[PDB]
């Protein structure tokens, strides 16, 4: 239980759901974990549940000054899990401009400029692993998810460009594309949606967040030392059908 | 013999390059063609050279008020070609915030809300065809194209979602993903870049803009009556290698 | 007449998607050769098409027949690899003999016909090769395991051939169709294509003429910069 | 401890990627059965692996040998379809006999081994199948036409099998490796530079991907391709 000993791991949106479980797995493997989120009360609680010296830093990925402060507060990261993200739904005809801009500001812009800062240090040191959390709706057309799927699709392309830009200096970049997963947000907002998506999956069920974190752990760890530029689908068969 | 006789088409960025050749092919096929651009002088010259009653409407895809006024001036369209776009290059470490936001405003946001307006009439009438121009860098990792490829990969996802949302009402949606093409902008800005990309293509050459336009015409026309939600790669084999 | 002066060979050109592809190309001025196993159906198909289209009898599952076909039509500019069978069975039900027949017909016959015909294209410096695949080679449909695999092998062959022949100007592409109303899909698989169509954004099956239009495009000079790619003609099947 | 109580069958487990995959699983508590044609290397590989691992001789090109193999291990929880060959020749140079052997070995033998082993997995309601493919099945590399076609067929089978068996809890996935320093590859290549990582892989690096997909860690991963190729597919 020491495969990540000596590595610092930053997990955006790591105070709930898939981010919480990914930070838990990496702390248990000996990494020094930093998690971020907006709600300070819930972030400090999440860092205690995780234990192993995990610490919380408040940051809003939608504000670029906050992103730059986060990068300043963790200038030595070996594992970056870009997990923070929102996914409100609306048909194209119902979608508003302000919601469009917040989705791109949060899901794309904040992750882009955090990577620009953190990867520079990884490239200097000659080692690092970056994992971007995407979505099945970025690979198939589900009505109501045009904007959300478009943000994660841009992340899929960034995974490829970044892997080619940083690979010469030993830095790996990959995506984890999850299917419908039971998290507090999906339970509150999209309770029937995830169940409807699940009826069309081969495994015919939704995922526990731990099952998604297991794929994040693999790609972050040195077990995936030859894995870069790729997408790891964790969707119970959704992309296959 | 004019297969598009009776239809109205709107080509964004149709005053030079791939867009101008797509408009010329459609106007020759008997469609009533509207072309848009930012510079009014070169717009009127383009409309004049195209002939066949083609008209110009000035619009800036980056300004949403301008996009709204464009939708008003061309309300009922049967063919929409989303071709307008920009592609400046920079490494992820050199990329600036202003340039990031302009690339997404022009390539993604403007097309999104033009479609939201144009597709409403296509759905009500029960027929229509939308063609989105993407890029090879959205499917393979090219250093220096992180943002640009990310904007076009968002558009690839929108093609899938939109085809699922508008399909029941007869509206088709597809992408054309071009390889390196000789245009006014690539010959003045990316002269050595396109030949470098051409060297690793199975066809070992760059394309004329008309060669890209033939794919756009096919997808816009009743010949492609069963084609929707897909990408047509016109790239000399780049995606295959 | 876009295809004037060009010779086109269509395997399985006596019925269904192949028949309509040959009809389109003949109407474009091409000298079309259609092939099939049944001599009566072939002669009737050539008359139905017109335009000097001629029939040549061959069995793609027999390599001697394949070699005999390439000898009767040595100089082809357009080759449409359309002949194929698609019987359905779950993996637990699938028999050995049907497995071998599916690969013999759908893969081996096309491979060595391409090896023969593409030699002349490469030496002449031009040509277009269109391989007919299937949606089941891209998504998992129960009961189509062997069929999808043969067409997936064909998809990969498109990429390898595009790279090997592209230096000499020869293009290679795949057409991946959705459920199409041919006499075979109506006799057998009658309700399967309906179930598939209900899950497509267009919510319908295709007429064979609609698949043929994609074959015509990739085969013609209009697609001069298109090689190594898959053109999906499936009502949105791949996107959902 | 993670694979304790499970039985894993690795075809081509006496060398290269297969040997390292079977090694990782045995060291995780699985009862490992490896298979190959050569009996002397097979018994050595079984002793090399240790942990009670055993060797069963079989030729994937002979369906009677494949049937005998399945009957000697009817209770497999993990199946790694790793045996394969990859000779090269341009399309114009490819011979009929070599074409048929490539499909007989890489596709037919795997297909009917799966048809037997998946029955027990479906009955029990759990199991994991891992098919080893190749980058050449997704990109066009001159000289790999037949080899890549056989692996592309496996890629499609992964999806169909995921749909057919997933209705009863059985997962099926592909592992697509890049260039790897196995004994066959070192002899065939003699004297990679286009990959983002700019190096070839050690066999153990491919085996780690096999292990993850085979283990309960990947409990929600099915029908997918895991690319372990130094960035080849992305470029
Ligand atoms: N079904 C699924 O759950 C599913 C499926 C596919 C993909 N995904 C992807 O998986 C990722 C995580 O999913 P999830 O269900 O675990 O989400 P979640 O439970 O709602 O948690 C999201 C995390 O992101 C943080 N966050 C949200 N907006 C932020 C902002 N503007 N700045 C900084 N942090 C912000 C939240 O912290 P605060 O509450 O303090 O703001 C929270 O810690 C997302 O990117 C999602 O797109 C999820
Ligand atoms: N090698 C290639 O050329 C290549 C390869 C792959 C993909 N593509 C894609 O193909 C499309 C066209 O490429 P191209 O080379 O033909 O471009 P181009 O020659 O430079 O022409 C661009 C057109 O878009 C218009 N435009 C630019 N910015 C605009 C804005 N903010 N608002 C409204 N109109 C705007 C321009 O009008 P004004 O001149 O008046 O500003 C012009 O008519 C682009 O979307 C590009 O991403 C090109
Ligand atoms: N729904 C669909 O129809 C659909 C969907 C996706 C893909 N496809 C693919 O599209 C292609 C054509 O489909 P289709 O429905 O139009 O087929 P079809 O109507 O049943 O006709 C098949 C053609 O192939 C010939 N053929 C069959 N076996 C042959 C052999 N061993 N050697 C030589 N010729 C042979 C037949 O002629 P003879 O009978 O006289 O031998 C016939 O001309 C097939 O490759 C199929 O896999 C079809
Ligand atoms: N660079 C790479 O090495 C590379 C790259 C991409 C994909 N792959 C894939 O990875 C897999 C393993 O690669 P590898 O380099 O480790 O191969 P390898 O070292 O040559 O070992 C192949 C194994 O398959 C067995 N085998 C061969 N033919 C057989 C047959 N007819 N029946 C039964 N067993 C048979 C061999 O046993 P015997 O010696 O006793 O016959 C041996 O154990 C292959 O499927 C290959 O396609 C490899």
PDB file of N, CA, C and O in Angstrom, chain C residues 27-70:
ATOM      1  N   UNK C  27     -25.023   4.970 -65.004  1.00  0.00           N
ATOM      2  CA  UNK C  27     -25.670   6.203 -65.427  1.00  0.00           C
ATOM      3  C   UNK C  27     -24.708   7.384 -65.452  1.00  0.00           C
ATOM      4  O   UNK C  27     -25.012   8.402 -66.086  1.00  0.00           O
ATOM      5  N   UNK C  28     -23.559   7.277 -64.785  1.00  0.00           N
ATOM      6  CA  UNK C  28     -22.545   8.321 -64.829  1.00  0.00           C
ATOM      7  C   UNK C  28     -21.507   8.098 -65.925  1.00  0.00           C
ATOM      8  O   UNK C  28     -20.451   8.738 -65.903  1.00  0.00           O
ATOM      9  N   UNK C  29     -21.778   7.209 -66.876  1.00  0.00           N
ATOM     10  CA  UNK C  29     -20.889   6.995 -67.994  1.00  0.00           C
ATOM     11  C   UNK C  29     -19.838   5.923 -67.804  1.00  0.00           C
ATOM     12  O   UNK C  29     -19.056   5.677 -68.729  1.00  0.00           O
ATOM     13  N   UNK C  30     -19.791   5.275 -66.645  1.00  0.00           N
ATOM     14  CA  UNK C  30     -18.781   4.258 -66.398  1.00  0.00           C
ATOM     15  C   UNK C  30     -19.129   2.964 -67.125  1.00  0.00           C
ATOM     16  O   UNK C  30     -20.298   2.650 -67.359  1.00  0.00           O
ATOM     17  N   UNK C  31     -18.092   2.214 -67.494  1.00  0.00           N
ATOM     18  CA  UNK C  31     -18.252   0.852 -67.989  1.00  0.00           C
ATOM     19  C   UNK C  31     -18.275  -0.068 -66.776  1.00  0.00           C
ATOM     20  O   UNK C  31     -17.234  -0.320 -66.160  1.00  0.00           O
ATOM     21  N   UNK C  32     -19.457  -0.568 -66.427  1.00  0.00           N
ATOM     22  CA  UNK C  32     -19.669  -1.300 -65.183  1.00  0.00           C
ATOM     23  C   UNK C  32     -19.648  -2.799 -65.445  1.00  0.00           C
ATOM     24  O   UNK C  32     -20.220  -3.283 -66.431  1.00  0.00           O
ATOM     25  N   UNK C  33     -18.976  -3.534 -64.560  1.00  0.00           N
ATOM     26  CA  UNK C  33     -18.994  -4.990 -64.535  1.00  0.00           C
ATOM     27  C   UNK C  33     -19.544  -5.424 -63.184  1.00  0.00           C
ATOM     28  O   UNK C  33     -19.015  -5.024 -62.139  1.00  0.00           O
ATOM     29  N   UNK C  34     -20.599  -6.233 -63.201  1.00  0.00           N
ATOM     30  CA  UNK C  34     -21.197  -6.754 -61.978  1.00  0.00           C
ATOM     31  C   UNK C  34     -20.901  -8.241 -61.877  1.00  0.00           C
ATOM     32  O   UNK C  34     -20.805  -8.950 -62.886  1.00  0.00           O
ATOM     33  N   UNK C  35     -20.754  -8.719 -60.641  1.00  0.00           N
ATOM     34  CA  UNK C  35     -20.413 -10.111 -60.395  1.00  0.00           C
ATOM     35  C   UNK C  35     -21.344 -10.708 -59.349  1.00  0.00           C
ATOM     36  O   UNK C  35     -21.854 -10.010 -58.467  1.00  0.00           O
ATOM     37  N   UNK C  36     -21.567 -12.009 -59.476  1.00  0.00           N
ATOM     38  CA  UNK C  36     -22.419 -12.756 -58.570  1.00  0.00           C
ATOM     39  C   UNK C  36     -22.317 -14.223 -58.914  1.00  0.00           C
ATOM     40  O   UNK C  36     -21.729 -14.604 -59.929  1.00  0.00           O
ATOM     41  N   UNK C  37     -22.907 -15.049 -58.052  1.00  0.00           N
ATOM     42  CA  UNK C  37     -22.848 -16.493 -58.246  1.00  0.00           C
ATOM     43  C   UNK C  37     -23.947 -17.018 -59.159  1.00  0.00           C
ATOM     44  O   UNK C  37     -23.728 -18.000 -59.880  1.00  0.00           O
ATOM     45  N   UNK C  38     -25.120 -16.396 -59.144  1.00  0.00           N
ATOM     46  CA  UNK C  38     -26.268 -16.894 -59.891  1.00  0.00           C
ATOM     47  C   UNK C  38     -26.266 -16.271 -61.285  1.00  0.00           C
ATOM     48  O   UNK C  38     -26.413 -15.051 -61.424  1.00  0.00           O
ATOM     49  N   UNK C  39     -26.101 -17.110 -62.314  1.00  0.00           N
ATOM     50  CA  UNK C  39     -25.997 -16.605 -63.681  1.00  0.00           C
ATOM     51  C   UNK C  39     -27.315 -16.008 -64.165  1.00  0.00           C
ATOM     52  O   UNK C  39     -27.314 -15.015 -64.903  1.00  0.00           O
ATOM     53  N   UNK C  40     -28.445 -16.605 -63.778  1.00  0.00           N
ATOM     54  CA  UNK C  40     -29.740 -16.066 -64.181  1.00  0.00           C
ATOM     55  C   UNK C  40     -29.983 -14.691 -63.568  1.00  0.00           C
ATOM     56  O   UNK C  40     -30.410 -13.761 -64.261  1.00  0.00           O
ATOM     57  N   UNK C  41     -29.717 -14.544 -62.269  1.00  0.00           N
ATOM     58  CA  UNK C  41     -29.901 -13.246 -61.628  1.00  0.00           C
ATOM     59  C   UNK C  41     -28.938 -12.215 -62.200  1.00  0.00           C
ATOM     60  O   UNK C  41     -29.289 -11.036 -62.340  1.00  0.00           O
ATOM     61  N   UNK C  42     -27.722 -12.642 -62.548  1.00  0.00           N
ATOM     62  CA  UNK C  42     -26.750 -11.706 -63.086  1.00  0.00           C
ATOM     63  C   UNK C  42     -27.157 -11.158 -64.440  1.00  0.00           C
ATOM     64  O   UNK C  42     -27.060  -9.954 -64.693  1.00  0.00           O
ATOM     65  N   UNK C  43     -27.618 -12.039 -65.332  1.00  0.00           N
ATOM     66  CA  UNK C  43     -28.059 -11.592 -66.648  1.00  0.00           C
ATOM     67  C   UNK C  43     -29.285 -10.695 -66.543  1.00  0.00           C
ATOM     68  O   UNK C  43     -29.428  -9.738 -67.312  1.00  0.00           O
ATOM     69  N   UNK C  44     -30.176 -10.984 -65.593  1.00  0.00           N
ATOM     70  CA  UNK C  44     -31.334 -10.123 -65.383  1.00  0.00           C
ATOM     71  C   UNK C  44     -30.932  -8.776 -64.796  1.00  0.00           C
ATOM     72  O   UNK C  44     -31.546  -7.753 -65.119  1.00  0.00           O
ATOM     73  N   UNK C  45     -29.897  -8.751 -63.954  1.00  0.00           N
ATOM     74  CA  UNK C  45     -29.457  -7.493 -63.364  1.00  0.00           C
ATOM     75  C   UNK C  45     -28.796  -6.596 -64.400  1.00  0.00           C
ATOM     76  O   UNK C  45     -29.001  -5.377 -64.393  1.00  0.00           O
ATOM     77  N   UNK C  46     -27.994  -7.179 -65.296  1.00  0.00           N
ATOM     78  CA  UNK C  46     -27.351  -6.388 -66.340  1.00  0.00           C
ATOM     79  C   UNK C  46     -28.381  -5.739 -67.259  1.00  0.00           C
ATOM     80  O   UNK C  46     -28.198  -4.599 -67.701  1.00  0.00           O
ATOM     81  N   UNK C  47     -29.474  -6.447 -67.555  1.00  0.00           N
ATOM     82  CA  UNK C  47     -30.519  -5.864 -68.391  1.00  0.00           C
ATOM     83  C   UNK C  47     -31.298  -4.796 -67.633  1.00  0.00           C
ATOM     84  O   UNK C  47     -31.682  -3.771 -68.210  1.00  0.00           O
ATOM     85  N   UNK C  48     -31.540  -5.019 -66.340  1.00  0.00           N
ATOM     86  CA  UNK C  48     -32.244  -4.028 -65.532  1.00  0.00           C
ATOM     87  C   UNK C  48     -31.459  -2.723 -65.449  1.00  0.00           C
ATOM     88  O   UNK C  48     -32.051  -1.637 -65.426  1.00  0.00           O
ATOM     89  N   UNK C  49     -30.126  -2.811 -65.411  1.00  0.00           N
ATOM     90  CA  UNK C  49     -29.288  -1.618 -65.329  1.00  0.00           C
ATOM     91  C   UNK C  49     -29.200  -0.920 -66.678  1.00  0.00           C
ATOM     92  O   UNK C  49     -29.403   0.296 -66.779  1.00  0.00           O
ATOM     93  N   UNK C  50     -28.877  -1.670 -67.730  1.00  0.00           N
ATOM     94  CA  UNK C  50     -28.661  -1.070 -69.035  1.00  0.00           C
ATOM     95  C   UNK C  50     -27.264  -0.481 -69.159  1.00  0.00           C
ATOM     96  O   UNK C  50     -26.319  -0.913 -68.494  1.00  0.00           O
ATOM     97  N   UNK C  51     -27.138   0.519 -70.034  1.00  0.00           N
ATOM     98  CA  UNK C  51     -25.894   1.278 -70.196  1.00  0.00           C
ATOM     99  C   UNK C  51     -24.693   0.379 -70.485  1.00  0.00           C
ATOM    100  O   UNK C  51     -23.569   0.672 -70.070  1.00  0.00           O
ATOM    101  N   UNK C  52     -24.917  -0.724 -71.197  1.00  0.00           N
ATOM    102  CA  UNK C  52     -23.825  -1.625 -71.510  1.00  0.00           C
ATOM    103  C   UNK C  52     -23.193  -2.305 -70.315  1.00  0.00           C
ATOM    104  O   UNK C  52     -22.058  -2.779 -70.416  1.00  0.00           O
ATOM    105  N   UNK C  53     -23.888  -2.355 -69.180  1.00  0.00           N
ATOM    106  CA  UNK C  53     -23.395  -3.099 -68.031  1.00  0.00           C
ATOM    107  C   UNK C  53     -23.379  -4.589 -68.345  1.00  0.00           C
ATOM    108  O   UNK C  53     -24.336  -5.132 -68.905  1.00  0.00           O
ATOM    109  N   UNK C  54     -22.286  -5.255 -67.987  1.00  0.00           N
ATOM    110  CA  UNK C  54     -22.118  -6.669 -68.286  1.00  0.00           C
ATOM    111  C   UNK C  54     -21.861  -7.462 -67.011  1.00  0.00           C
ATOM    112  O   UNK C  54     -21.316  -6.945 -66.032  1.00  0.00           O
ATOM    113  N   UNK C  55     -22.260  -8.730 -67.040  1.00  0.00           N
ATOM    114  CA  UNK C  55     -22.204  -9.614 -65.885  1.00  0.00           C
ATOM    115  C   UNK C  55     -21.067 -10.616 -66.047  1.00  0.00           C
ATOM    116  O   UNK C  55     -20.797 -11.089 -67.155  1.00  0.00           O
ATOM    117  N   UNK C  56     -20.398 -10.926 -64.937  1.00  0.00           N
ATOM    118  CA  UNK C  56     -19.369 -11.959 -64.886  1.00  0.00           C
ATOM    119  C   UNK C  56     -19.643 -12.838 -63.673  1.00  0.00           C
ATOM    120  O   UNK C  56     -19.815 -12.328 -62.561  1.00  0.00           O
ATOM    121  N   UNK C  57     -19.693 -14.151 -63.885  1.00  0.00           N
ATOM    122  CA  UNK C  57     -20.029 -15.080 -62.812  1.00  0.00           C
ATOM    123  C   UNK C  57     -18.787 -15.419 -61.995  1.00  0.00           C
ATOM    124  O   UNK C  57     -17.734 -15.741 -62.555  1.00  0.00           O
ATOM    125  N   UNK C  58     -18.911 -15.349 -60.670  1.00  0.00           N
ATOM    126  CA  UNK C  58     -17.815 -15.728 -59.788  1.00  0.00           C
ATOM    127  C   UNK C  58     -18.353 -15.976 -58.386  1.00  0.00           C
ATOM    128  O   UNK C  58     -19.424 -15.488 -58.013  1.00  0.00           O
ATOM    129  N   UNK C  59     -17.589 -16.753 -57.617  1.00  0.00           N
ATOM    130  CA  UNK C  59     -17.877 -17.054 -56.216  1.00  0.00           C
ATOM    131  C   UNK C  59     -16.699 -16.536 -55.405  1.00  0.00           C
ATOM    132  O   UNK C  59     -15.584 -17.055 -55.527  1.00  0.00           O
ATOM    133  N   UNK C  60     -16.946 -15.517 -54.574  1.00  0.00           N
ATOM    134  CA  UNK C  60     -15.879 -14.904 -53.790  1.00  0.00           C
ATOM    135  C   UNK C  60     -15.276 -15.860 -52.772  1.00  0.00           C
ATOM    136  O   UNK C  60     -14.120 -15.676 -52.382  1.00  0.00           O
ATOM    137  N   UNK C  61     -16.027 -16.866 -52.334  1.00  0.00           N
ATOM    138  CA  UNK C  61     -15.507 -17.866 -51.423  1.00  0.00           C
ATOM    139  C   UNK C  61     -14.594 -18.895 -52.045  1.00  0.00           C
ATOM    140  O   UNK C  61     -14.145 -19.812 -51.353  1.00  0.00           O
ATOM    141  N   UNK C  62     -14.303 -18.764 -53.338  1.00  0.00           N
ATOM    142  CA  UNK C  62     -13.445 -19.684 -54.076  1.00  0.00           C
ATOM    143  C   UNK C  62     -12.326 -18.859 -54.694  1.00  0.00           C
ATOM    144  O   UNK C  62     -12.586 -17.991 -55.531  1.00  0.00           O
ATOM    145  N   UNK C  63     -11.082 -19.126 -54.285  1.00  0.00           N
ATOM    146  CA  UNK C  63      -9.979 -18.292 -54.757  1.00  0.00           C
ATOM    147  C   UNK C  63      -9.678 -18.514 -56.236  1.00  0.00           C
ATOM    148  O   UNK C  63      -9.261 -17.573 -56.923  1.00  0.00           O
ATOM    149  N   UNK C  64      -9.881 -19.732 -56.745  1.00  0.00           N
ATOM    150  CA  UNK C  64      -9.770 -19.956 -58.185  1.00  0.00           C
ATOM    151  C   UNK C  64     -10.783 -19.111 -58.949  1.00  0.00           C
ATOM    152  O   UNK C  64     -10.454 -18.503 -59.974  1.00  0.00           O
ATOM    153  N   UNK C  65     -12.025 -19.071 -58.467  1.00  0.00           N
ATOM    154  CA  UNK C  65     -13.024 -18.197 -59.069  1.00  0.00           C
ATOM    155  C   UNK C  65     -12.580 -16.739 -59.006  1.00  0.00           C
ATOM    156  O   UNK C  65     -12.709 -16.001 -59.990  1.00  0.00           O
ATOM    157  N   UNK C  66     -12.037 -16.314 -57.863  1.00  0.00           N
ATOM    158  CA  UNK C  66     -11.556 -14.940 -57.719  1.00  0.00           C
ATOM    159  C   UNK C  66     -10.482 -14.638 -58.756  1.00  0.00           C
ATOM    160  O   UNK C  66     -10.520 -13.603 -59.434  1.00  0.00           O
ATOM    161  N   UNK C  67      -9.506 -15.539 -58.897  1.00  0.00           N
ATOM    162  CA  UNK C  67      -8.461 -15.342 -59.897  1.00  0.00           C
ATOM    163  C   UNK C  67      -9.043 -15.317 -61.308  1.00  0.00           C
ATOM    164  O   UNK C  67      -8.579 -14.554 -62.165  1.00  0.00           O
ATOM    165  N   UNK C  68     -10.063 -16.140 -61.568  1.00  0.00           N
ATOM    166  CA  UNK C  68     -10.710 -16.142 -62.877  1.00  0.00           C
ATOM    167  C   UNK C  68     -11.474 -14.845 -63.125  1.00  0.00           C
ATOM    168  O   UNK C  68     -11.546 -14.378 -64.267  1.00  0.00           O
ATOM    169  N   UNK C  69     -12.043 -14.252 -62.072  1.00  0.00           N
ATOM    170  CA  UNK C  69     -12.737 -12.977 -62.216  1.00  0.00           C
ATOM    171  C   UNK C  69     -11.762 -11.857 -62.557  1.00  0.00           C
ATOM    172  O   UNK C  69     -11.998 -11.076 -63.487  1.00  0.00           O
ATOM    173  N   UNK C  70     -10.660 -11.758 -61.806  1.00  0.00           N
ATOM    174  CA  UNK C  70      -9.680 -10.707 -62.064  1.00  0.00           C
ATOM    175  C   UNK C  70      -9.109 -10.802 -63.473  1.00  0.00           C
ATOM    176  O   UNK C  70      -8.738  -9.783 -64.063  1.00  0.00           O
TER     177      UNK C  70
END
